[PDB]
Design a protein around this ligand. Sequence first.
Ligand SMILES: CC1(C)C(/C=C/c2ccc(O[C@@H]3O[C@H](CO)[C@H](O)[C@H](O)[C@H]3O)cc2)=[N+](CCCCCCCC(=O)O)c2ccccc21
Ligand SMILES: [Mg+2]
Ligand SMILES: [Mg+2]
Ligand code: NA
Length: 1021
Amino acid sequence: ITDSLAVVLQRRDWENPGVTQLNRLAAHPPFASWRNSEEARTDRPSQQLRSLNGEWRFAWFPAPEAVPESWLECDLPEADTVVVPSNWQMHGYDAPIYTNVTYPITVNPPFVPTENPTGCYSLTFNVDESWLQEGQTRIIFDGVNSAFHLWCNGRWVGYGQDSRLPSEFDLSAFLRAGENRLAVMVLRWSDGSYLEDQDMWRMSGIFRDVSLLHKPTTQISDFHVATRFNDDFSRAVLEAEVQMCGELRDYLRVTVSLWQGETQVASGTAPFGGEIIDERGGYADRVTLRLNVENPKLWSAEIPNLYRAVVELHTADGTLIEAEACDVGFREVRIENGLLLLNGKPLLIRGVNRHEHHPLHGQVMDEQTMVQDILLMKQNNFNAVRCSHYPNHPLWYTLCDRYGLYVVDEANIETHGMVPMNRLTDDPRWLPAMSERVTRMVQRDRNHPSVIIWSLGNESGHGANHDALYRWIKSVDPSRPVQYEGGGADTTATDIICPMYARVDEDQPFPAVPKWSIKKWLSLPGETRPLILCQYAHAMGNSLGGFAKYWQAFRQYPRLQGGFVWDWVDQSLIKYDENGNPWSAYGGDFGDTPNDRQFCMNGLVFADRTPHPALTEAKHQQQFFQFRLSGQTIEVTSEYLFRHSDNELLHWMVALDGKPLASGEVPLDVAPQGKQLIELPELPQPESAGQLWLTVRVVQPNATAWSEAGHISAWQQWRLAENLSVTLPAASHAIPHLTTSEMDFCIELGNKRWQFNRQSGFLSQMWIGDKKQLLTPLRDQFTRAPLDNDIGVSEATRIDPNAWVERWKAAGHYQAEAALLQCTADTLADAVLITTAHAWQHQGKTLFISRKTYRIDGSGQMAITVDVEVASDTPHPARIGLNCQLAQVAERVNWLGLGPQENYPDRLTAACFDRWDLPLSDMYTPYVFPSENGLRCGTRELNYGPHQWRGDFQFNISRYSQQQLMETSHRHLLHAEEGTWLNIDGFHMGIGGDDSWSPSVSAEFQLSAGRYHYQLVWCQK
Ligand SMILES: CC1(C)C(/C=C/c2ccc(O[C@@H]3O[C@H](CO)[C@H](O)[C@H](O)[C@H]3O)cc2)=[N+](CCCCCCCC(=O)O)c2ccccc21
Ligand SMILES: [Mg+2]
Ligand SMILES: [Mg+2]
Ligand code: NA
């Protein structure tokens, strides 16, 4: 009759933001309904919390009206068997859509398309007869994207929205003895989708755990854990509020126990009945228990000391009815005099935004991937994670509790694609839907100590609903600051100025929502709050240029307390090719249109969690140990707030142009915020030529729960003495001969022979024996394969004239062909010298001039001098150097300069100067969107096979031309070219990365001088 699909779907509850659930139970902290209290303290499994994960029957429909009525009674024969949890896009049933701002549906709230992909999950399962005669049996859906109706045994149970928070329903009256059948109809789109416009893949399905929980009729319905402290934290009080449902009776009592290991630290017991709260009395169904704790071990990210609270509901005669439990971190979060304090000390947030993404399972996470992310974060000096932009899987907070990470729990509210952004969040008709997303988050995660900051959501402007919900959290949970960046990052709905992509020194004064410089932002009249960037340093491919500038500002300004880098993972997806070889897909690679292509990849680690090179630049800048050194005394400073360096030694080394001369390892016993001065022993000071470099590293001898033994926590380098080569070079035993063609200038000397084309003006090729050496003439280069930062949002459709790639193209940097002006040759006693002079023009105007002279002496060496002019009105070049295609292909590359990893001018602080030797594999960075990559800076010795270059240059080297990288869109479509492409540059523009839609390379890294000069020397070996 009434459990019909006809009647249920007729309500169209998914096109009505006033109905966000039906018959859904109240929210609460994680429950397990342990019937034994030692089971609760131990955090065992519980015989009352069954998992329904596993094999379900699934069938896909284009619209819920297409679902046959029989599906409520029987299984559909057309249905496949599917593992749950699952995003059905990852099973291939329809495409995942990657859109950023633009809604994947027609913006017509509260309505959704008639084409509403419907996933009809079903599951036949058994229930013990004990669950049917006593108690309450409920089903828990931890995550259903994006809304669903629930049937059990053909009868309709309820409805749910908000896809990142659990939905629980009472099944007691619906369950049969023996076999039962669930039928959950998941809708891809709902009115809740208008609040779920996060910049991510748009997936759907039952993508989190499903569970049965059995509880007694008399039950713990909710419990809150609070910890107040005294002046110096030597004494804490743990307040525990416990609420019950069921038959209230005079013999019912509640005990709350606090443990740490096998030690019961405290406990108290009381009957129900709270304090009088107003004229009608108090809450008879509640009670508050206060437990004193002398010298409590405090919870930090540095030391995640956890107690365990056990909540026993029992009778006076001692019959245990039910037990719940939670981990407890003794920690106080407050903002005082403008600073965010944790346990009275000012935090410095080494944060990152982290989406729930897995390249194969989509948005279906587990435990191994979560622990892998957490280990990788702490191993790269990260103390905080923002759950951008929704409540995470419950296990995530438990893990940050234990491994020690500060967490910003963010409500599942983003209306980015609305025009304006506060069209829904300022509408009071949407306040209920938004309140449910906020209140149910707090009701779920309020006992997790790792949660230090509540967030109202992301990119939804500033509306009155934000103010109402901000004030609701402050009233319900004073334990935590509330932050929200929408509407200009400093509205009345945030305790923290939390801008996204605000720059350090540069004002971006957009109307109504200016992104002021973070330094200036603090200074604004009447402004007193701390500033923690909700998002900063857009790590889209080759990026994080200018990252050190942020952390200089963080350390110099007290109220600049850090921020969360955007972001942790590439949201790459996995496709399969001709032969089933996997490759990384991004926007549009599933036929999804419209889409925002590579903007789904902003991580410091690839989707497989392999690191990008920018990761160690973050690790270096966010390291907890700062170093100064005067002469021989290293000043090392702890930026830890709670721990001594009781598992850290400093290894030190001093090396002249690579070769080590002195080792050493002295222990470190620096106090939190303290200092320690280490006198270095008599370091050797040789009269030898070259630069002497000191390198100190902080090494953890013992294994942590997040590192292995020997892990490096921090490092720093200084150039000590440098003695300049004063020696007159070793005399020659031969004079090279010059040969003047009508077309060529050719020089010869033993094995070596060089050939300059007098019509081109370039070194066309050189010889060693009967073995050719070049496949392309050694020519200039003023361009690079554009990085995602140079492209920005520029597409073939809508072009971004302000983007760097478009300023270059419009001036003809890529179409510029050389036009030779002078190319001589002269016989000198010591050598032969050809001087060239090329000009680059496009549509008339001469952009660049490059006067060179090459000097091949008895030397066996070839001295190239380059003196480049660049017009004062052409856009600054991305590069000023040379490139050529080597015939040689060698297995290893050795160089003297900053390494070992990729590094660029505005991203080289993590690199160290040394002699580095890697396979050619690692001199190319496999950015999924190919670009310029693998560059090493500060280099003046490069050894590849028989060749050797020296000067003071920057170089990248691999199998890929930079017009192949430019004309290719996916890494898996690149093929090794014949030979080896090498770009040698005396200068190279920075990569930028404060954001990836505006030019973000600061003036000091723009090739803007006008005249330029570098010197290379080519030689065999
Ligand atoms: C300023 C700029 C670069 C621009 C930039 C808009 C812009 C940039 C970024 C953005 O969202 C950002 O995208 C990131 C992707 O990794 C992250 O999600 C980040 O959290 C988020 O803030 C949202 C909008 N548009 C693209 C506009 C598309 C519609 C978006 C909303 C702006 C509007 O229409 O008012 C044009 C178009 C022509 C010239 C210049 C521009
Ligand atoms: Mg609805
Ligand atoms: Mg957005
Ligand atoms: Na993005």
